[PDB]
């Protein structure tokens, strides 16, 4: 195992924004940084919180209906509102 | 009881800085905002984290020796480095 260095991780999440083009840039880097060694970082509800306040205001309105439970649902649901009427299908 | 409204609380902590004159301004408002309805906000270590990265760099160095455990120790220890060689004694 390794030492965690938590403060860079709170530093690295702070860079992410809505200037990132579309949801796919947001969901990718957040998979990169946040999954990199959380030993026990916070509870489930608080892990929603730092994710959700980052997001765009309109996407919070549609993800209000319905509200998700985990990050995976939140990452999926905020993707699906733009994945529907837009795609390039990768392989 | 009341609805919590968590997002204002993360908004209100963001205003605090090192432009606040001395530690006493920092420790007072943080007692006001953070104690106002945390139902279960986060774990103990994470509650250290949002407190500590706010603080001044030199105060992190002295509070490194020794590192505190709870917020109360952290609020006390970062006060004591300036409460020693400076006071107006209140009543």
Residue numbers in the entry:
A (entry chain A), B (entry chain B): 105 to 195
Sentences from the paper on this structure:
Here, we have determined the structure and molecular architecture of the Ty3 capsid by 3D and 2D cryo-electron microscopy (cryo-EM) and compared it with those of the retroviruses. In the case of Ty3, Gag3 is cleaved into CA and NC domains. Formation of the capsid is important for genome protection and is an essential step in the retroelement life cycle.
The densities for the nine non–symmetry-related copies of the Ty3 CA-CTD were aligned and averaged to generate a higher resolution 4.9-Å map. The homology model of the Ty3 CA-CTD was then flexibly fitted into the map and showed very good agreement with the density. The mutations (E190A/R191A) in that region cause a strong phenotype in yeast. These mutant Ty3 particles form long filaments in cells, instead of spherical particles, indicating that the C-terminal part of Ty3 CA-CTD is important for the capsid assembly. Strikingly, the quaternary arrangement of the PR- Ty3 CA-CTDs is almost identical to that of the CA-CTD in mature HIV-1 capsids at the level of dimer, trimer, and even pentamer. Despite the similarity in the CA-CTD quaternary packing, there is very little conservation of residues at protein–protein interfaces.
